[PDB]
Amino acid sequence: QCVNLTTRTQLPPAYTNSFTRGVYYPDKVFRSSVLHSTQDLFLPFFSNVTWFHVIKRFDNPVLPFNDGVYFASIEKSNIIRGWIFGTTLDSKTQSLLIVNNATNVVIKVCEFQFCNDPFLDMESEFRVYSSANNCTFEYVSQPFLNFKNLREFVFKNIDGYFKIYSKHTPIDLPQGFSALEPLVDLPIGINITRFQTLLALHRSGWTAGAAAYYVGYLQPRTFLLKYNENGTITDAVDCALDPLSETKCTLKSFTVEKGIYQ
Amino acid sequence: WFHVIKRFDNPVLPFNDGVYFASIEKSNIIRGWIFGTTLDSKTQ
Amino acid sequence: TSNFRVQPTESIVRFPNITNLCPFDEVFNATRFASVYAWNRKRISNCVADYSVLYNLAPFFTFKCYGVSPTKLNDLCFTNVYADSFVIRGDEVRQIAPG
Amino acid sequence: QTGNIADYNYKLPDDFTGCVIAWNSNKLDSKVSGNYNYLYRLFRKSNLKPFERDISTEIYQAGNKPCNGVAGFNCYFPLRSYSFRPTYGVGHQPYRVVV
């Protein structure tokens, strides 16, 4: 059940920067007071990130599904609801659907029939898909959810395994660094090409509160990981940003002495 | 050590590994040995 | 001349905590089964089979398995299990056999 | 190797030296009603050592109930007959293997 909406305004997307954001744990391997380097998908430091604003602003665009993705959102009053993953968003192929209402989170993958503008509506209406024919996997869990709260999500599809990593850090992108603990792993193994997002609508014609989210793409470039005495990530250094950090990667240390180095 | 004289020492011992048999034998008394898992017709 | 090292004795780590991912009582504890001709089909996938609950009934009949010995059903890892349940009179219980 | 015969019937050590020689015996060794003269074992208490022939006719016991030389509850016959027939495929075709 989907209807056409003509209340959306046309505005170009905003662009901001990703100073010290987009670093998670490479694996479930515990480390203490050691300097380790790993090769995997990660968000480049000081890299471009796309910004969107939703207030009457409606931003539900279409974005690709590159090997690494980064999702950050400055979220208040839990306007966000979930995400949509798939290839063509129809019944011809399997699609991944994420919803999380006020009581629980439902992780479902199926050949759902998605319209051109998915939306969600306390909450008393559920109009996302239309049909579900070929699927046998369902998952439920405890719900994950002035500005006061922040959300950071990354999705990885390696060896048919879908990984969702979440971290909440209550306090433009704020300046600082924080860890990104993994949340849940699911062995879906599907083909995903274009992904969407879900936004809740408040009825009082619909009105939504002020919100904004960031979308980015990770890169397989080599990084540096520092593990403190508490096992959390404190600082990270790119090996291909500037020559000083390149030599930090080569010398495997966060400081360099006075001398000549190649 | 087993001594035979009126002593008749013919015990049955398990074969877990290889065994070493030494005999201070005179006039060819010892003739042979019997090896088997259970010493019956159910086994070889 | 050499080195000193003690050797391990046992190899035990944890226990099979793994819970059942799919119900199994619907194929043998049902109130009424389907007919012999319109026998229903049950699909078993992405789950784990707990075959240690095999002893439940005193009048339990022998296995008489064909092609798979019941000794080695545990270390096997299958990908699809088919359940076909229908009622047979007691005087043709040996009719289910090849040939 | 690991299998029904490679574990309980015939084992080959890693330092074994020789040849394996095989032929199709479906013309001679097969029978229209089935050749039951050749039999194979499927139930053993432990893995059989290489170059060892097992000739025990004892009933394999799985539970705590003594089999008393006959099959029954948790008791199965280790010996099983072959299905050598000339009208079937490769799986039922007997092969003369000389080691």
Add this chain to the structure above:
Amino acid sequence: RSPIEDLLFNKVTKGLTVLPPL
């Protein structure tokens, strides 16, 4: 130890093992 040697000592900070010197 004389304080010079003390300062010199203070200024210096799986099968494999380190044999203590004689």
Add this chain to the structure above:
Amino acid sequence: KQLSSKFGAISSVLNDIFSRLDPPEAEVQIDRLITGRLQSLQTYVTQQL
């Protein structure tokens, strides 16, 4: 740190290779691993000398 090198093998761990790979080739893989470790040890001994 040179102990955790693949040295042309599937993994740097020995027991998973032993319990997963067919011994016939697993012997070749473990031989390559131990001879690479021997080469690294010989290089270390030469540098120490």
Add this chain to the structure above:
Amino acid sequence: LSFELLHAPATVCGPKKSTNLVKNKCVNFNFNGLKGTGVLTESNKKFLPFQQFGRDIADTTDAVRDPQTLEILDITPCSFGGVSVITPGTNTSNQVAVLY
């Protein structure tokens, strides 16, 4: 009841995860594929819930958490090392002493 033999990716495996646990002894554990020998010792270091097994500077499993229990155990190797023998000349005497 009928099954399929190697016609699809495997889904229903049987339970092969040993019987019990061992404390204060160096025995060969198999933590879901990885094999190692060491003594399970309690750790005062706090462990994040997502972490499963630790890693030292030697890139080996020195810490681990239970796959079911929330408790965390450290892998410490038991007594090991070389042994040396001290002795005088064989022409003088034959008394020897052990040294670790």
